Amino acid sequence: IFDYVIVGGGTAGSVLANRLSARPENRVLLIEAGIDTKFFWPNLTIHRAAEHPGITREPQFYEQGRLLGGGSVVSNRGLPRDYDEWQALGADGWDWQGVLPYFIKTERDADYGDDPLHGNAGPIPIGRVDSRHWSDFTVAATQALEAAGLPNIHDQNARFDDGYFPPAFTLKSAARGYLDASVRVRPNLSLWTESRVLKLLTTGNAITGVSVLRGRETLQVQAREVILTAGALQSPAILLRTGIGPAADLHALGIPVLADRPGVGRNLWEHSSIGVVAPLTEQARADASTHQLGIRASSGVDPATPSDLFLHIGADPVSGLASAVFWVNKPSSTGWLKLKDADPFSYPDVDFNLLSDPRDLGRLKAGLRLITHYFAAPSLAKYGLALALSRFAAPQPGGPLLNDLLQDEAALERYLRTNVGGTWHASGTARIGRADDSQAVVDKAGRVYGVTGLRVADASIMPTVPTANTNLPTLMLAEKIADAILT
Amino acid sequence: IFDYVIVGGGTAGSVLANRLSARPENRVLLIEAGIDTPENNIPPEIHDGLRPWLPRLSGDKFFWPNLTIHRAAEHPGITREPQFYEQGRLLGGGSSVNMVVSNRGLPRDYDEWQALGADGWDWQGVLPYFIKTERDADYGDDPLHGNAGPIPIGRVDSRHWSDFTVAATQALEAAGLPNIHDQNARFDDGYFPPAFTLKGEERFSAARGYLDASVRVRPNLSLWTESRVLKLLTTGNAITGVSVLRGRETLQVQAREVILTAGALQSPAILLRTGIGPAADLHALGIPVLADRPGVGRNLWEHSSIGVVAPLTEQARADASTGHQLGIRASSGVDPATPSDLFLHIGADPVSGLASAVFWVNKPSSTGWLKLKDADPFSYPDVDFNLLSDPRDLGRLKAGLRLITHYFAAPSLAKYGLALALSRFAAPQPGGPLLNDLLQDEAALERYLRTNVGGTWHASGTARIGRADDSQAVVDKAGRVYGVTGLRVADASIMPTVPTANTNLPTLMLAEKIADAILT
Numbered sequence A: 001i002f003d004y005v006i007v008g009g010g011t012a013g014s015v016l017a018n019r020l021s022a023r024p025e026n027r028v029l030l031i032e033a034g035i036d037t038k039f040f041w042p043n044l045t046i047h048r049a050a051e052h053p054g055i056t057r058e059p060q061f062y063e064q065g066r067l068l069g070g071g072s073v074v075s076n077r078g079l080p081r082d083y084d085e086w087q088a089l090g091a092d093g094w095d096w097q098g099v100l101p102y103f104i105k106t107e108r109d110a111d112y113g114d115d116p117l118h119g120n121a122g123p124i125p126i127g128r129v130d131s132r133h134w135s136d137f138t139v140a141a142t143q144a145l146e147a148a149g150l151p152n153i154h155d156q157n158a159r160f161d162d163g164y165f166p167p168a169f170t171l172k173s174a175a176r177g178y179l180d181a182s183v184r185v186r187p188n189l190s191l192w193t194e195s196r197v198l199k200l201l202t203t204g205n206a207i208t209g210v211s212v213l214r215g216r217e218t219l220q221v222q223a224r225e226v227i228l229t230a231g232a233l234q235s236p237a238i239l240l241r242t243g244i245g246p247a248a249d250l251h252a253l254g255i256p257v258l259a260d261r262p263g264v265g266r267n268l269w270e271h272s273s274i275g276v277v278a279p280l281t282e283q284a285r286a287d288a289s290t291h292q293l294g295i296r297a298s299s300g301v302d303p304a305t306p307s308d309l310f311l312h313i314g315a316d317p318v319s320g321l322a323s324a325v326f327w328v329n330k331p332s333s334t335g336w337l338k339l340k341d342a343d344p345f346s347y348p349d350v351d352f353n354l355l356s357d358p359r360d361l362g363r364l365k366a367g368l369r370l371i372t373h374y375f376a377a378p379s380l381a382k383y384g385l386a387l388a389l390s391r392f393a394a395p396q397p398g399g400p401l402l403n404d405l406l407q408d409e410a411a412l413e414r415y416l417r418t419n420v421g422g423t424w425h426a427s428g429t430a431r432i433g434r435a436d437d438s439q440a441v442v443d444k445a446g447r448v449y450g451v452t453g454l455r456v457a458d459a460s461i462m463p464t465v466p467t468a469n470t471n472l473p474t475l476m477l478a479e480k481i482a483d484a485i486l487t
Numbered sequence B: 001i002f003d004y005v006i007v008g009g010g011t012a013g014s015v016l017a018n019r020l021s022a023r024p025e026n027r028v029l030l031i032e033a034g035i036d037t038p039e040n041n042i043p044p045e046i047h048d049g050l051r052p053w054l055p056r057l058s059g060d061k062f063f064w065p066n067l068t069i070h071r072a073a074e075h076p077g078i079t080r081e082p083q084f085y086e087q088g089r090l091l092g093g094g095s096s097v098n099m100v101v102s103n104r105g106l107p108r109d110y111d112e113w114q115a116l117g118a119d120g121w122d123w124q125g126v127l128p129y130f131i132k133t134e135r136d137a138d139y140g141d142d143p144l145h146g147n148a149g150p151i152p153i154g155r156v157d158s159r160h161w162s163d164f165t166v167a168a169t170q171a172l173e174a175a176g177l178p179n180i181h182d183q184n185a186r187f188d189d190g191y192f193p194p195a196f197t198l199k200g201e202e203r204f205s206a207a208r209g210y211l212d213a214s215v216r217v218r219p220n221l222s223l224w225t226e227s228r229v230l231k232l233l234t235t236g237n238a239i240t241g242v243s244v245l246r247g248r249e250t251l252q253v254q255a256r257e258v259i260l261t262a263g264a265l266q267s268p269a270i271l272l273r274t275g276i277g278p279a280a281d282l283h284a285l286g287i288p289v290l291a292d293r294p295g296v297g298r299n300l301w302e303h304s305s306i307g308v309v310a311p312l313t314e315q316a317r318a319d320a321s322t323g324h325q326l327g328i329r330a331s332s333g334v335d336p337a338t339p340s341d342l343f344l345h346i347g348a349d350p351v352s353g354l355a356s357a358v359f360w361v362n363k364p365s366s367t368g369w370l371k372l373k374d375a376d377p378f379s380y381p382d383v384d385f386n387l388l389s390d391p392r393d394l395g396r397l398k399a400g401l402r403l404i405t406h407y408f409a410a411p412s413l414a415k416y417g418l419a420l421a422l423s424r425f426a427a428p429q430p431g432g433p434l435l436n437d438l439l440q441d442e443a444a445l446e447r448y449l450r451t452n453v454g455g456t457w458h459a460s461g462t463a464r465i466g467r468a469d470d471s472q473a474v475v476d477k478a479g480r481v482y483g484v485t486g487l488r489v490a491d492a493s494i495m496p497t498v499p500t501a502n503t504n505l506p507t508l509m510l511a512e513k514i515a516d517a518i519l520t
Ligand SMILES: Cc1cc2nc3c(=O)[nH]c(=O)nc-3n(C[C@H](O)[C@H](O)[C@H](O)COP(=O)(O)OP(=O)(O)OC[C@H]3O[C@@H](n4cnc5c(N)ncnc54)[C@H](O)[C@@H]3O)c2cc1C
Pocket: A007, A008, A009, A010, A011, A012, A013, A031, A032, A033, A034, A063, A064, A065, A066, A067, A068, A069, A070, A071, A072, A073, A074, A075, A076, A195, A196, A197, A198, A229, A230, A231, A232, A234, A423, A424, A425, A426, A458, A459, A460, A468, A469, A470, A471, A472, A474
């Protein structure tokens, strides 16, 4: 009988395996469906933009890590206001002051590790490119940003106003930080790779372990506590197949209901993305030859949500393209997922419902206007780049000219509703909330309401997606939950 | 016949006199009601920059005598009284009598000025004029700063901080606030050594910056001190001169353009008396309406303020010795649309024996108005700042008091054992209720705040820039008054909103920009 069985060995699971097995008396098992460290869940499709008249949506492949260390290189925290809002929404203690010590605990900052908002002893090394190694292309971009009044904020992780910066990244995954060779040798930590949890085992309303598919056979593993860290799409599906979720939906599938929890699979957040590309002219190719540049900006669409855009300006001599890709980093739209059926091998039916709130369409237009503004500044205009729209994930030629789409706002709206993407920042499907909030799924230490023996401790638990790439925040949150468990 | 007559030789007037007279062909007269402050004879209570509070201890001497205002919105169960409102009356105006702090606000303030219909007045647009005004002693080489302008700006070295200040910073670090170092090129929440204008120990007003001996020698520049403009001279809808009281004699001065830079309470009164204002108000006083402009005297902004004080305990007084020290930009959480809506100072004064935490709402929702009492050129306007008319400002003030509580509970500050009590902002003194007791009694706190809420001398917005089709607008993007010709306003009156800032540096900026628009 294990003390803790952790379901899924990705970013959060690795943290928890490490932290919980640090105590010799904790017998811990981490189960991961992928290989030890093609690399994704095969044939996993999702609906992207909200159903809309005139537009025809199809299912799209959505990459989710399927390997030890999972989704884990850009490594950023978000803003104080994100975490203060998590507390306002019922995540007691998850305000900025509450999460900041866990952001510190996770990291070793090469550049700023002695500053009071940083760590210098954590397992995840974080650093930035020296802004002196910047290409002349990047420099020209910074001169255009300067002319609009943007400072170089240097360190996006301890300075929170609008501006530009060298992006912080982890380069030497969460597997090599948290499951290094010292940790894997621990006697009390087991680590099953290529092994897939099928179902949670229950005794009444207690979860008592898991059924696992390992090699060719199905095993039962008994457990005092089960922690789901299967990801924001699969953790809530596991909950739903277990009978934890909206009763009517489960009864429709013949699933016996352990607890009627209407928040399970709701509150699906993402960041809404789009690209702009141009072929590199010769000056631009040459200048680019000498993660460079991130930009935090405000769209002005909603005064309540400053710093709601993230943009990256870059040039790549290899594909022969300049690009400006960006996303809505503080959105208003949310989606949902539900089961297709009770089969443990089925993926859920996922609808991100992107641009369902028209403020997000407003934000993408504003971002596009900002990009035309910057590239009109002399130091970027000199390159004579011809900017065309593209999908965020597949930045390639084929889209219409930026300057011409902005002059046809109905055509602009059609293009964005058709081609809007995600940034793989799926979150919020098993959210933290108060004991008397009927849409909450877990308490402030990840314990699932309505049952015993079960926590959730991955990106599913985020009350909202933060103003950030979701890997560092997930590491933080796993750190915080581990500490609460250890009590 | 002057090309430009500038009414009011204060912060903006000084800038405009200097910039417009830089071209030999421009015949410029600057008219100032108060005394001269020439560099060889600055009054000692003005010249002392380490004690900028001293003009206020000289009484009336350096201010508009007996200028009174209404402060807090009328509210049932609280009577309010007229209160004296300091406004500079001498060359350099407000910058000759101020607390010497020099900050810009935030990009969002000016981006909002553009959204409100002030085209060109966004952050990108005002930034070059902020750079032009300053020579920053600490960061003048950096991208968002200047190193060659006439107003020197600097900060205390953090090394030189008292142990008390240092303890306060530890308390704020525990709250997760960084030292932002430079409040004028970094715009997130946190704490900093405030930026201020001084030349060594001496005050450095806009008069010293812009009206020095080398500029006063200009033969095309005229400067009339102890001379008070009474009326604008009008021929149809064109303004064509001024009448001026000099001693007991009244004179007329002809002008191609008149620029009003008389301050945010007096510039709009001049407009109203000329017949440029809401028509029904003017009819009621029998002033002939030259142009029906309902925004004149509306849109009066301010920063709403309160203090918290405690007797210095032994350790606190000792810690206070060792070395404008510490400012704090913070968010109230009242409205997610207005981050950084609070400003706080924490310090210890061994003279009074008082530690204090004074703060104001730096992005308010409430606005007030002024109107004329009568047509007499010598009367002051009827001014109602209408503070806490919008309940969110009450919430911001309660939120800042809670923030102050939290900070002072930190070990670095708790060790001092300070008994924090409420106070009016302008005159910090005993007599107010204990902070911790009054936060246990919301209705008592309300009544206290509504009774004792103060301003910060950041009056603004009473002749606002706005769009050529906006009934509430008074001036265009270059300060030209809609409905007449020959008249501009170029002072703090024209700000569409008060920024997240003490208003001296933003006024210098706006006068630089307006001068430039004029010269093009
Ligand atoms: C291609 C891509 C690029 C990204 N880039 C970045 C980036 O640059 N910066 C950033 O901050 N974030 C980025 N993200 C997002 C970030 O990686 C995720 O938000 C983060 O990994 C979420 O952590 P998690 O622990 O919730 O889930 P995951 O890290 O996805 O871990 C879930 C794990 O559970 C396993 N699993 C699922 N079901 C079962 C089962 N039944 N039994 C056993 N195991 C199971 C999966 O195989 C997986 O290993 C990226 C994501 C992707 C997909």
